[PDB]
Amino acid sequence: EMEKEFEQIDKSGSWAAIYQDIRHEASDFPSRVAKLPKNKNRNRYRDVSPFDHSRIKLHQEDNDYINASLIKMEEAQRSYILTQGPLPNTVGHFWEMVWEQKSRGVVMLNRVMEKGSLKCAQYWPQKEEKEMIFEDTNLKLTLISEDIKSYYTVRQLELENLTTQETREILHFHYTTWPDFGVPESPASFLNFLFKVRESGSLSPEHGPVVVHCSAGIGRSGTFCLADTCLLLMDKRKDPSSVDIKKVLLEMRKFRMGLIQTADQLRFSYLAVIEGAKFIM
Ligand SMILES: COC(=O)c1cccc(NS(C)(=O)=O)c1
């Protein structure tokens, strides 16, 4: 059981060592399409690339590339699209992917500005009356409503296909309080946020996979998916303590490189799941 394994690693301070064994054991697959010169300006970090095998393809004939990965957790019956914070020139692509994958929810785990730099383009409207048109992808986006709370904001948006006049309602879940450095002291607000996404039905198989991002779509995004999948497997299994968070992380890393960027994020994920197990036990 992980609670005991938690104290063990913690008491021994072996987090950096566990973390290194995961780095070593992690899968490595081609990312040939990411590295093509015509895609250079579609990537935010040159060292954060989708594997070819699990990359999301845009349905435009021109260039089908977006820095986005489908993570399929077969046993948990859960899929996630992990992507980078959109660039000024990829906001249109981002909303096209959301449209084409029939996603209900977008989960955002960064602020637009952190440490005095831009981590992300402003890809959603700030006022009801000021909608955004994406000329390249023929999509209109409108803010319908916005519910600002202490730790997070939920924003009801209408995505309209200008080509076909279909509209869909998208939910934007924005965790607004992840600190600039390290990880939250308590996982309580993060778990509350995860349960709010769950309740929305955005994680449900009725819908396309949820789109999850931070700046790179591997660190905070990783923690989100890892916690969701682990808690869900603990419901599904005859023996809940058979769930190995290191095994689960390694399965997710077959789909996108670098999920969980630091030993700090690894520790926080353990804490979140343990506290998660507790809330629902
Ligand atoms: C901003 O409006 C909302 O909060 C909203 C709108 C529509 C649906 C939901 N589902 S929920 C209460 O689980 O998050 C929320």
| DSSP per-residue string spanning 190-221 | HHHHHHHHHHTTTTSTTSBPEEEESSSSSSHH
Question: Are the C-beta atoms of 228 and 199 separated by less than 8 Å?
Answer: no
Method: X-ray
Phi, psi of 153 (to 5 degrees): -125, 135
**What tokens appear for 168 in the block?**
């869909």
**Residue the block writes with tokens 């799941």:** 273
CB neighbours (10 Å) of residue 87? Answer: 18
Q: Is the CB of 153 under 6 A from ligand 1?
A: no
Domain boundaries, the chain: 1-281
Residue 74 corresponds to which amino acid?
E
Q: Is the CB of 143 under 6 A from ligand 1?
A: no
Going from the Cα of 226 to the center of ligand 1, the distance in angstroms, rounded, reads: 23
| Residue located nearest, by CA, to atom 15 of ligand 1 | 200
**What tokens appear for 9 in the block?**
């690693």
14: helix, strand or coil: coil
Beta pairing partners, 103: 208
Nearest-atom index, ligand 1, CA of 146: 1
